[PDB]
Amino acid sequence: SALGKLQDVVNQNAQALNTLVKQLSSNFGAISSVLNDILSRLDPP
Amino acid sequence: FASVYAWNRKRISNCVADYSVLYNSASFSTFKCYGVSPTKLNDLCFTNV
């Protein structure tokens, strides 16, 4: 009133989940990152 | 109609754009859209033309 070996696990796991969430906003070479804006202004082919 | 090296640009704004009077009109030789589909232009909204 020390615990860094326990805070390291919490931090590493949050840092991985954040990267997974944030990769949902890359185009990977498409026109939009959001699927609804490809579906709305393009036709199936 | 101006020539190819001094083409004229008109900005369109503040109006409903009905491509229905244009897409169901069989009077043009080429109608090629890129990034959009000429049948879904009445569902979108645009910032400028």
Swiss-Prot record, chain B:
Changing L22I: In strain: Omicron/XBB.1.5, Omicron/EG.5.1. Binds to host ACE2. RBD also interacts with the N-linked glycan on 'Asn-90' of ACE2. Cleavage of S generates a polybasic C-terminal sequence on S1 that binds to host Neuropilin-1 (NRP1) and Neuropilin-2 (NRP2) receptors. Interacts with host integrin alpha-5/beta-1 (ITGA5:ITGB1) and with ACE2 in complex with integrin alpha-5/beta-1 (ITGA5:ITGB1). May interact via cytoplasmic c-terminus with M protein. May interact (via N-terminus) with host bilirubin and biliverdin, thereby preventing antibody binding to the SARS-CoV-2 spike NTD via an allosteric mechanism. Attaches the virion to the cell membrane by interacting with host receptor, initiating the infection. The major receptor is host ACE2. When S2/S2' has been cleaved, binding to the receptor triggers direct fusion at the cell membrane. When S2/S2' has not been cleaved, binding to the receptor results in internalization of the virus by endocytosis using host TFRC and GRM2 and leading to fusion of the virion membrane with the host endosomal membrane. Alternatively, may use NRP1/NRP2 and integrin as entry receptors. This is Spike protein S1. It comes from Severe acute respiratory syndrome coronavirus 2. The gene is S.
